[PDB]
Amino acid sequence: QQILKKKAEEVKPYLNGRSMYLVGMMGSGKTTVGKIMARSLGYTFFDCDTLIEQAMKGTSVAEIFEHFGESVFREKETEALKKLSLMYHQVVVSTGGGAVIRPINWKYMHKGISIWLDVPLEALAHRIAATYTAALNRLSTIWDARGEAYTKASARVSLENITLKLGYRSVSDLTPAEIAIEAFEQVQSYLEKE
């Protein structure tokens, strides 16, 4: 809470109003962590998926999926990310789990600093299910497809490593603030080394 103020003040000068993008699997807490980060920096926070929902005038995302499939949503995500990187500075943006699939999105996101919330699949399945093995199976299938792509991010925040360092029981005991403090630390380490 104070560490947050202090850790945000310390990163402002390397940032030069560059934007930050939170990437990760479904359920990885991108949105809550992102808002906390944004608020600490005095930055504007945007949720990619929320923006796309709202730009859909008179139809929904659900209808885009039934009628056009994943491919047409993917172009909307791309158009949304393109917009955000060319037009806004000093923003924090959480993206959907699939934003990382297309190399075009890495072109816009790499104009900024990207932060991957690496949450172990088992914890994702447990967050999702509160059945566990059924969530886990699905995430495991998705992980085999996207896994490699998250590693393209500037910084990685391991929720496993945070829980060890803090002596907590499972990643589920972590607070959004404690995760944002680690995101701050890794962003800072990345920026110190260019």
Taking the C-alpha atoms of residue 42 and residue 91, their distance in angstroms, rounded to an integer, is 9
The DSSP result for 43-102, as a single string, is: PEEEEHHHHHHHHSTTS-HHHHHHHH-HHHHHHHHHHHHHHHHHH-SSEEEE--GGGGGS
Is residue 96 a known part of a binding site? no
The answer to whether residues 21 and 113 touch, using CB atoms and an 8 Å cutoff, is yes
Q: Report the alpha-carbon distance of residue 17 to residue 38 in Å, rounded.
A: 12
Q: Which two tokens stand for residue 73?
A: 């949503």
| Resolution, Å (one decimal) | 2.3
- Ordered by start, the domain boundaries in the chain are 1-194
Helix (H, G, I), strand (E, B) or coil at 116: strand
The C-alpha atoms of residue 75 and residue 30 are separated, in whole angstroms, by 21
DSSP character string of 8-48? HHHHHHHHTT--EEEE-STTS-HHHHHHHHHHHHTPEEEEH
The DSSP element (H or E) to which 117 belongs, if any, is: strand 113-118
Instruction: State how far the Cα of 115 lies from the Cα of 187, in Å rounded to an integer.
Output: 7
CA distance 11 to 96: 25
Asked if 139 contacts 28 with a C-beta cutoff of 8 angstroms, the reply is no
Is 109 annotated among the ligand-binding residues?
no
Q: What is the DSSP letter of 16?
A: T
Q: Pull the structure tokens for residue 48.
A: 């990619």
Would the annotation count 26 as a binding residue? yes
**Is 94 annotated as a binding-site member?**
no
28: annotated binding-site residue? yes
Classify domain 1-194 at the CATH class level.
alpha beta
* Residue 74 among known ligand-binding residues: yes
Rounded to an integer, what distance in angstroms lies between the CA atom of residue 165 and that of residue 173?
13
The span from the CA of 105 to the CA of 43, in Å, is: 22
Report which of 19, 15, 17, 29 is spatially closest to residue 177, judged by C-alpha positions. Answer: 29
What token pair was written down for 52?
Answer: 């796309």
Tell me, what DSSP letter sits at residue 114? E
Are the C-beta atoms of 93 and 21 separated by less than 8 Å?
yes
The CA distance from 135 to 142, in Å, is 11
Contact at 8 Å (CB) between 162 and 173?
no
User: Is 114 assigned to a binding site?
Assistant: no
Instruction: Answer yes or no: is 27 a known binding residue.
Output: yes
Structure tokens at 19: 């934007």
* Strand ranges across the sheet with 20-23: 44-47, 91-94, 20-23, 113-118, 155-158
Sign, CA torsion 179/51/71/63: positive
User: For residues 134 and 116, what is the distance between their CA atoms, to the nearest angstrom?
Assistant: 24
List all residues 6 or more positions away from 106 whose beta carbon is below 8 Å from its beta carbon: 100, 152
Question: Which residues on neighbouring strands pair with residue 21, listed in sequence order?
Answer: 93, 114
User: Is position 98 annotated in a ligand binding site?
Assistant: no
